[PDB]
Ligand binder design. Structure first.
Ligand SMILES: *[C@H](N[C@H](COP(=O)(O)O)Cc1c[nH]cn1)c1c(COP(=O)(O)O)cnc(C)c1O
Ligand SMILES: *[C@H](N[C@H](COP(=O)(O)O)Cc1c[nH]cn1)c1c(COP(=O)(O)O)cnc(C)c1O
Lengths: 354, 354
């Protein structure tokens, strides 16, 4: 007898689905584990046309985002979060069982998840001690690689990749692979974006999202910025109707001029709050080292991190354990929320210090 | 020099993206080409939690649908339309370059599109003259096939597949392949659903959608019904957050008891209207033959169909040309809308008759 499981693909049977879930409904009061904006921003529907299919790429959304990002509308693609953007790039440039992707741990886990699920080889070149790119290492492992993912600022470490090294990487991949800069957190450091580099690099793609700074993770709305050639190719592999009407509706509102002003105020808010938490964390006894951040989360190495993580978890303070990530032994990622939430963490951590 | 296009996958460069688009904004007044419910049904948001990520599988949505469909919640998966359900099945059971899918033309075009885009072989066994399954033909082409798609009632022909033949097909695939019954239009003939067959067939999956009868195509919300084993396997290949909050929100409302009552009234409405259009169409001179339908669209063979199609198109009456589909030479698919819209088609067609 053959079981349904035997009919499934081998890679599908062996893979471990992404570990994002870690809920405790009604148990945790403070959520600082998903890099979400701490407060809800309300939006109501304005288009009551739900009986009709939406546009494959809602015009209002594409133009409003292109205006905001400073690029041409033909250089923008909108999808179900930056997660889908990650999938699309692999789906269009990587031949299963032949080509490979390359990323540098410790970083965002979906690059690997998508590739492994799709059936594409994952090539890894860990970043250096300061988490900057190991350029020499990358140059020696580009064979068969079609897509390179580099998160900047990086998750979960928080720092920006030296643009000078991005220049090098883009030169190493010229005519060989697509370089994808994941800018899911660029809103917190807009001046460090590579969006203006499109004219110089035909193989440069950029991932963006409304989940983080825009405080609309609930919409599952993201974008890919790239030259026409690339965008047109991705459009050939995307689902016919990737964005729902209600999402296109509120997303377009969120991208209006006033929406951008609000977003920027949310950023200033988070940055100011981050610098507070960072200053306070360095003084706490159980805190060994706090790493610089250009995002809405802070990575810190603790003394007995598993114990600390568990302690705060039992107290309703939900953080994000990084202990199992390469080079991040003893580290926990703390999302920046409100002043009250930061104070909860601070006090709680001071209650440790053993 | 290497171009970006040269970096793309071969199959991606050669494939022709799905042909669903065929708009004429502000030009066409009557849309009977996408099998959408003719009138909008309004829904407002109730959950202002957009700053937080949604559940991977919204509980309210899964339970409300499971209640409606008469199956267990663990036998339900919710995705971005039935289109994604099609993708997921291939993504989980078909090894690119090794396994294949099988469908029977003329039918829904996405089965082939997804497989071709993913990189999986498409095996075809055209249906018989009456569009019923060519069982003997299928039995002889199952080697290497992992997923079989059969739309019932079928699009664009409109008829139901003899359940007796579904029995045969399910026996032929036992322990060899997953049989997927696409029931995107089962709401119009609920008693013909195979949902109650799950306990007998471990390899049976069923595609459902809120786009059609539910009049919520704008939500991009669909479902897959299958035994736990299958659903759990698909959950291993689905994107972490496939459904947005606003969509889960209104979808759950649409599936409430009162929502189901409304849906059923929409169905009765469409069926009554369909039988009118069918009766009237058979009398029109340019109409050669009208085929029986158990859905919200009617297939009919005309005299000089390309000419008729163009004529009505220029008049704001948007139909769906099937002329290039196998065995459907001279056929146009007419979506059932309102009495006024049906009258527009009738009169317009009578204005032809040359
Ligand atoms: C956003 N990821 C979310 C939180 O970060 P982490 O706990 O996984 O390090 C959670 C998530 C979303 N999908 C899977 N996990 C994120 C994205 C995707 O953003 P979208 O909501 O638009 O799909 C892309 N890149 C990065 C670096 C991050 O953090
Ligand atoms: C619904 N398909 C829509 C109209 O039918 P057609 O003109 O393609 O024959 C259009 C569409 C949607 N995606 C691509 N084209 C449909 C589905 C999908 O329904 P969802 O809106 O939930 O993804 C699945 N199966 C069938 C048979 C049909 O018709």
């Amino acid at each position: 007898t053959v079981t349904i499981t035997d009919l499934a693909r081998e890679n599908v049977r062996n893979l471990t689905p992404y570990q994002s879930a870690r809920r405790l409904g009604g148990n945790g009061d403070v959520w600082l584990n998903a890099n979400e904006y701490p407060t809800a921003v309300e939006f109501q529907l304005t288009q009551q046309t739900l009986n009709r299919y939406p546009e494959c790429q809602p015009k209002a959304v594409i133009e409003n985002y292109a205006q905001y990002a400073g690029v041409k509308p033909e250089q923008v693609l909108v999808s179900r979060g930056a997660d889908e953007g990650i999938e699309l790039l692999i789906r269009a440039f990587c031949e299963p069982g032949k080509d490979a992707i390359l990323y540098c741990p410790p970083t965002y886990g979906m690059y690997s998840v998508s590739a492994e699920t799709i059936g594409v080889e994952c090539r890894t070149v860990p970043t250096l001690d300061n988490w900057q790119l190991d350029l020499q290492g990358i140059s020696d492992k580009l064979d068969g690689v079609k897509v390179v993912y580099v998160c900047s600022p990086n998750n979960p470490t928080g720092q920006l990749i030296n643009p000078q090294d991005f220049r090098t990487l883009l030169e190493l991949t010229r005519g060989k692979a697509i370089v994808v800069a994941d800018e899911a957190y660029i809103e917190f450091c807009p001046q460090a974006s590579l969006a203006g580099w499109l004219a110089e690099y035909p193989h440069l793609a950029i991932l963006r999202t409304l989940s983080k700074a825009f405080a609309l993770a609930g919409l599952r709305c993201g974008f890919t910025l790239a030259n026409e050639e690339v965008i047109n190719l991705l459009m050939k592999v995307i689902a016919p109707y990737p964005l729902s009407t209600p999402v296109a509706d509120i997303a377009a509102q969120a991208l209006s001029p006033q929406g951008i002003v609000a977003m920027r105020e949310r950023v200033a808010q988070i940055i100011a709050e981050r610098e507070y938490l960072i200053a306070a964390l360095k003084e706490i006894p159980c805190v060994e080292q706090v790493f610089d951040s250009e995002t809405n989360y802070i990575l810190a190495r603790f003394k007995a991190s598993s114990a600390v993580f568990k302690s705060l978890w039992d107290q309703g303070i939900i953080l994000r354990d990084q202990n199992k990530q390469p080079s991040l032994s003893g580290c926990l990622r703390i999302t920046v929320g409100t002043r009250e939430e930061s104070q909860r963490v601070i006090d709680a951590l001071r209650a440790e210090q053993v």
